[PDB]
Enzyme design. Structure first.
Site, PDB file in Angstrom:
ATOM      1  N   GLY A  17      78.381  43.769  34.776  1.00 31.43           N
ATOM      2  CA  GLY A  17      78.117  45.168  34.386  1.00 31.43           C
ATOM      3  C   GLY A  17      78.953  46.148  35.186  1.00 31.43           C
ATOM      4  N   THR A  18      78.823  47.444  34.888  1.00 30.93           N
ATOM      5  CA  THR A  18      79.573  48.484  35.617  1.00 30.93           C
ATOM      6  C   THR A  18      79.178  48.394  37.060  1.00 30.93           C
ATOM      7  OG1 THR A  18      79.136  49.683  33.646  1.00 30.93           O
ATOM      8  CG2 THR A  18      80.278  50.897  35.392  1.00 30.93           C
ATOM      9  N   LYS A  37      73.527  41.471  44.027  1.00 35.27           N
ATOM     10  CA  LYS A  37      74.284  42.416  43.183  1.00 35.27           C
ATOM     11  C   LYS A  37      75.322  43.064  44.101  1.00 35.27           C
ATOM     12  CE  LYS A  37      72.020  45.133  40.557  1.00 35.27           C
ATOM     13  NZ  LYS A  37      71.369  46.132  39.708  1.00 35.27           N
ATOM     14  N   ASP A  90      65.539  36.735  31.576  1.00 35.68           N
ATOM     15  CA  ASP A  90      65.106  38.053  31.112  1.00 35.68           C
ATOM     16  C   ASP A  90      64.426  37.908  29.747  1.00 35.68           C
ATOM     17  OD1 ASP A  90      66.883  38.602  28.867  1.00 35.68           O
ATOM     18  OD2 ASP A  90      68.483  38.884  30.332  1.00 35.68           O
ATOM     19  N   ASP A 131      65.299  53.132  31.128  1.00 40.80           N
ATOM     20  CA  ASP A 131      66.112  52.089  30.502  1.00 40.80           C
ATOM     21  C   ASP A 131      65.278  50.829  30.292  1.00 40.80           C
ATOM     22  OD1 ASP A 131      68.333  51.502  29.080  1.00 40.80           O
ATOM     23  OD2 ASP A 131      69.539  50.791  30.751  1.00 40.80           O
TER      24      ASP A 131
END
Ligand SMILES: COCCn1cc(Br)cn1
Ligand SMILES: COCCn1cc(Br)cn1
Lengths: 293, 262
Positions: A17-18, A37, A90, A131
């Site tokens: 991801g970004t 992360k 997830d 989100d």
């Protein structure tokens, strides 16, 4: 805090991801499996990113069994490592791969009940998630499900001020945002959970729009087009247009046919147009649907 | 309604009350600062007031920055030449936390009048984050004020803006304001504003919510009242100028009461 990358052994990449790359890793001293992360700051001419500053500051405060835990933050002039509790999967992947003839009702109820605990905990600590979608809900092998990815979260004041617009992944985005409302609140997170509840039952997104206007129209065609009766103020909203087609609200038993009377009740209260009447997480925990959880 | 989070406002209030105790600066911190003084801090905060209005930042941003600054100077000794660098990095951090559209780092460099480098600003950002342990979601005077505002019968924009103004004035003066928690200054500020505009006093409903009474607010109120009276003579004037603006109802032009009867 008290951590150093020399004590971690990377195992595999688990996502990207970004934000950057996430690795599954193992603490070589304690045995703990974690998710790392990585946020590159060396690639950053704008210093530490605002998403990371929010994620870290807000997660430091949120200790709850149904929110993924930030165990540590490792500081380097070149890099920034967030050490998270690790969860194997997830909700999106669990839905696509293992839930082929469905998620059983006991497990739906359990997950939704845990999501509401997590969300109620967020709201009690003045944090909007903004989100909530299946990709951002992590499940473990013990049957827990946990809110993750607070990169888009925000600490709110009471009453709320105007925050960033067009927040929330479109499919999960509340009508008040889609109508450009000056103010939005805890009700946006509930809408998302409502969409997710439906999605756990059917294994398909409830309102899969391709544009803000297509999103709205899909909602309107499902719950009827709102007016001043169902939702006072709607017709005064910045991106409300009188030309909007006026769709009849279809009977709710048709929206999610397999759902029972209690289910339908709870879902309807989650997807109420008027944010003021939309059920709170706190209130929803007492709903009869959870009686046997 | 939901914008006022009926189902969460008590939980949130209680939690902020806890957090304001954790996020509190050391009251005596300036005596242990060999090279800086209350007077220099006042200059800095006043400057940050100007920076917020030039970039049209939220007042919350301003309050957060001051909180970051005071906590940092609670554990880190700083030379007068670098006080502005700390302040700049605090404003950046606060903006990235609180603003929809934070000013870019380069703008932060620009306002320091090329005193510092982009590189210096970013390394201090890192240091402040280290010292604060990313603990940035601090309760401010404003977060309390806005909740207190829900107890006006009925709402009065002159009251609200005046209270905001008084709260802001307290940021300038470490002595005496470091010794009061955000929630108490906000209480004092609210009552003083309300009294000044409507003659009315700190509401009983707010006694229910807060457990504070005019009795318990008295010390802070006597200080805030003096700060209000002397405000036209203070060396620092940026808050008064700011609150002449119609945006804030020109409240800095209202006349303080000569006595409180408290
Ligand atoms: C889908 O598996 C993702 C692994 N993980 C990410 C965090 Br944050 C915690 N666990
Ligand atoms: C060397 O400068 C004195 C300290 N100071 C800087 C500001 Br901005 C406020 N005080």
């Amino acid at each position: 805090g008290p951590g150093s990358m020399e004590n971690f052994q990377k195992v595999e990449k688990i996502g990207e991801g970004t934000y950057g790359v996430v690795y599954k890793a193992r603490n070589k001293l304690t045995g703990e499996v974690v998710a790392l992360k990585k946020i590159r700051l060396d690639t950053e001419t704008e210093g530490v990113p605002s998403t990371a500053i929010r994620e870290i500051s807000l997660l430091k405060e949120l200790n709850h069994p149904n929110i993924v835990k930030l165990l540590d933050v490792i500081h380097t002039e070149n890099k920034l490592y967030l050490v998270f509790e690790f969860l194997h999967q997830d909700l999106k992947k669990f839905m696509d791969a293992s839930a082929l003839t469905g998620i059983p009702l006991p497990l739906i109820k359990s997950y939704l009940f845990q999501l509401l605990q997590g969300l109620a905990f967020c709201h009690s600590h003045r944090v909007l998630h903004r989100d909530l979608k299946p990709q951002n809900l992590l499940i473990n092998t013990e049957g827990a499900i946990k809110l993750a990815d607070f990169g888009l979260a925000r600490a709110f004041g009471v009453p709320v001020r105007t925050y960033t617009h067009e927040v929330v992944t479109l499919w999960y985005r509340a009508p008040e945002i889609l109508l450009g409302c000056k103010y939005y609140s805890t009700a946006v997170d509930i809408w998302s959970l409502g969409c997710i509840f439906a999605e756990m039952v059917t294994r398909r997104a409830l309102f899969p729009g391709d544009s803000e206007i297509d999103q709205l129209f899909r909602i309107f065609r499902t719950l009827g087009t709102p007016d001043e009766v169902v939702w006072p103020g709607v017709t005064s909203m910045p991106d409300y247009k009188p030309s909007f087609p006026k769709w009849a609200r279809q009977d709710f038993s048709k929206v999610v046919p397999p759902l029972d009377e209690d289910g339908r009740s709870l879902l309807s209260q989650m997807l109420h147009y008027d944010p003021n009447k939309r059920i709170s997480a706190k209130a929803a925990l007492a709903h009869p649907f959870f009686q046997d959880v | 309604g939901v914008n006022e989070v009926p189902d969460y406002h008590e939980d949130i209030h209680t939690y902020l009350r806890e957090m304001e105790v954790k996020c509190k600066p050391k009251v005596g911190y300036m005596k242990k600062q060999p090279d800086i003084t209350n007077s220099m801090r006042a200059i800095l905060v006043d400057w940050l007031v100007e920076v917020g209005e030039e970039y049209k930042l939220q007042n919350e941003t301003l309050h957060l920055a001051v909180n970051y600054i005071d906590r940092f100077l609670s554990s880190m000794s700083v030379l007068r030449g670098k006080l502005q660098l700390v302040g700049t990095a605090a404003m950046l951090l606060a903006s990235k936390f609180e603003e929809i559209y934070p000013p870019e780092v380069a703008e932060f460099v620009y306002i320091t009048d090329d005193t510092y480098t982009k590189k210096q600003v970013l390394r201090m950002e890192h240091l402040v984050l280290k010292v604060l342990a990313f603990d940035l979601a601090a309760p401010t005077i404003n977060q309390f004020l806005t909740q207190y505002f829900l107890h006006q019968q009925p709402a009065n924009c002159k009251v609200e803006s005046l209270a905001m103004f008084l709260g802001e004035l307290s940021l300038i003066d470490a002595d005496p304001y470091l010794k009061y928690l955000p929630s108490v200054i906000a209480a004092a500020a609210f009552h003083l504003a309300l009294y000044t505009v409507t003659g009315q006093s700190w509401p009983e409903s707010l006694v229910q919510k807060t457990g504070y009474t005019l009795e318990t607010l008295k010390p802070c109120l006597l200080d805030l009242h003096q700060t209000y009276l002397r405000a036209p003579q203070h060396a620092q004037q940026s808050i008064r100028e700011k609150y002449k603006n119609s945006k804030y109802h020109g409240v800095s032009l209202l006349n303080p009461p000569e006595t409180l009867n408290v």
